[PDB]
Amino acid sequence: ATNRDQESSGFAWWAGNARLINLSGKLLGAHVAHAGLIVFWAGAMTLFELAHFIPEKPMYEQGLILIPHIATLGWGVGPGGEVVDTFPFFVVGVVHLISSAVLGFGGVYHAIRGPETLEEYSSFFGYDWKDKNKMTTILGFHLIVLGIGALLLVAKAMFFGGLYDTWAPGGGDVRVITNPTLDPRVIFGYLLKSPFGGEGWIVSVNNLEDVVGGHIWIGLICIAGGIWHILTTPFGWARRAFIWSGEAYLSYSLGALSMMGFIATCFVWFNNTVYPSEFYGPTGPEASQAQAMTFLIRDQKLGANVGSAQGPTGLGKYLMRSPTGEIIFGGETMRFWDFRGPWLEPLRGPNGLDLNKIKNDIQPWQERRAAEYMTHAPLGSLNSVGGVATEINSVNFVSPRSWLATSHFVLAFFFLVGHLWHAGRARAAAAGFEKGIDRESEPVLSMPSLD
């Protein structure tokens, strides 16, 4: 019984993976077998979607989350978002699913057959949570891999076919990026933008050039950090500031993933550049703006002067001013006037929406987009009735942006909880009271009374 029971490890079955904290080989097996399940799921799910895909329905009408990520990368898609070749989705699927078997094979190998602990068999892979030099070394290696991985996305954009660019002229098309943005005033200007309305911090990045350039910077930054940590050991202030245990390292990463899940939730909900609406359905704001456009167009066609129609409240029924003066769509949509998308910007002049362009330059393709986007707003029920809560059954639809944002909020919230759990536990384990208060030296009893 090498731990593997409660009496030797001190952990019950329901906390059994904690029996692995100091079994580096068996722990490696569990990480790689879990890596296994992720690559597996990337594989199985892509194939499912492909087997269920009807090229003549919008992706967002079909419950696809993974195929839209491959389409965003410039494979299988043409002008407008149209699917031209499904083979690359098939490939991406199978390659992951096949790969998952080798991960699983070697994860199961290491968890069972292999040496339970790596420290005798090899001084390079073995480790000790407390070895602050060896831990930064692994960090630095993993950093390097990630800087490489970010540079792979640059390779795709600059050398290996480009990226789906929703902003592209003529309604959107795959495009080679060749002048990425490297001016760090732009790239890090995003980090300093307010996260509030009309700014949006990095969720606001709205053009592939800024995207590519920020992955050049992240990739290089990550490579220098990799090297730095491989060659450095932590400084005195960092030594005094942290907890150096397996669980603490876990709690730090759970904190980081939480933060990341929250940002992804807002990326997928607001951003229509790296989550193009052609594949993911319109954003919440985008549908709500599109409704106002729709009835601007309808009513103008009947002979309404939409710039002077005074609505019931005294505000303009179709057009009003934002608080800084821009001309924007009226009604509740007034909150969404920060919205920006390729179907609407053509009517945008310097003061906002331009009445002359509205009166004269609305093309049928914009009328169509706006009717499509309005009738696919990201509202729906949990059993996939599409519409407001009060709608009758008929439309089987929930926006992929609802699915992706809801799921990743839930996960982010729960990983913040994981962070607090393992953070405080790591603190109290290191200080020696995670199993309770010692009756013989109860600290409070040595303290002066409060009153």
Partner: protein, 334 residues
């Protein structure tokens, strides 16, 4: 010991009547600001144009509310999610009309309360305690984040945040039912299970320990005087309460490990309230409650109403009446 170190020691002193802490260094100012702004606003703020349609809603006592109807009214829908600090307005008169106090209060309050959570961790570390009380508080904290931050983010406006009033809270619940059918959402059903059962188990535990209190007083004095603060022994007979309660149902429906029993009391409502906070957070992104409207139809295709269709009729009453001047187009999409 120098200036910084004497201060550091005061801040983290476990001898202060109220623990301060590094978390408290943030919590104290942000809570004070929120509490002072809230109290002045509740009594005296002038009307606020919550829906951005130039139709102010009076929320303060001096303008003809009472305790039940008054509120700090949420900021204008014209503002959407834009940040509206005092210094961004042309005059306090503009900041008041547009509902600036709601932004100031909620931001300082959410910051203040996140550090309250943190301060619970901190003091438990100085006291040599186990750390996880702050995990329990995280259920109500998230719940508050859901109504004051997340739901505004998903809908694009703090105008659809929860109002800081008794009647405003009801307004918010009603509009939510209409737009998301929250009663029909499983996560809110989990939260009802959270709080009914937390109240259920809270009576059960009180009633059961109280039942098995060991005689230590006479008939005239309060039984409470049979516990002494700090006593080593337990004041009640848990064997006896298991003996009562095992028989009331059956032997294994009943706890006999005090530790297992109290973790259950902690876990039940905290989990339930996590789920309802998550339900609010996810309906923030319009993933709504089950929709069984016209789900049952007969051989010919007439609709056979269930109780769900009856809910939907009430929902529709809420839908068409709420914010009656604010919609110019036929779908209410946020």
């Amino acid at each position: 010991a120098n200036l910084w170190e004497r201060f550091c020691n005061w801040v983290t002193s476990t001898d202060n009547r109220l623990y301060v802490g590094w978390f408290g260094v943030i919590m104290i100012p942000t809570l004070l600001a929120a509490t002072i702004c809230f109290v002045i606003a509740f009594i005296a703020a002038p009307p606020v144009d919550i829906d951005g349609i130039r139709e102010p809603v009076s929320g303060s006592l001096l303008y003809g509310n009472n305790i039940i109807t008054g509120a700090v009214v949420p900021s204008s829908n014209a503002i959407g999610l834009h940040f509206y600090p005092i210094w961004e307005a042309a005059s306090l008169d503009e900041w008041l009309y547009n509902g600036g106090p709601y932004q100031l209060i909620i931001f300082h309050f959410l910051l203040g309360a996140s550090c309250y959570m943190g301060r619970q961790w901190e003091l438990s570390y100085r006291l040599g305690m186990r750390p996880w009380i702050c995990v329990a508080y995280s259920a109500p904290l998230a719940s508050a984040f859901a109504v004051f931050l997340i739901y505004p983010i998903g809908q694009g406006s703090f105008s659809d945040g929860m109002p800081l009033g008794i009647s405003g809270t009801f307004n918010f619940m009603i509009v939510f039912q209409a737009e998301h059918n929250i009663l029909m959402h499983p996560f809110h059903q989990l939260g009802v299970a959270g709080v009914f059962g937390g109240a259920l188990f809270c009576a059960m535990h009180g009633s059961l320990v109280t039942s098995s209190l060991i005689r230590e007083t006479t008939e005239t004095e309060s039984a409470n005087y049979g516990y002494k603060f700090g006593q080593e022994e337990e004041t009640y007979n848990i064997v006896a309460a298991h003996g009562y309660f095992g028989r009331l149902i059956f032997q294994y429906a009943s706890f006999n490990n005090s530790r297992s029993l109290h973790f259950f009391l902690a876990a039940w409502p905290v989990v339930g309230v996590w789920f309802t906070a998550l339900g609010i957070s996810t309906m923030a992104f319009n993933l709504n409650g089950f929709n069984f409207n016209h789900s049952v139809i007969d051989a010919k295709g007439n609709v056979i109403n269930t109780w769900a269709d009856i809910i939907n009729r009430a929902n529709l009453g809420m839908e068409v009446m709420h914010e009656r001047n604010a919609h110019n187009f036929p779908l209410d999409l946020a």
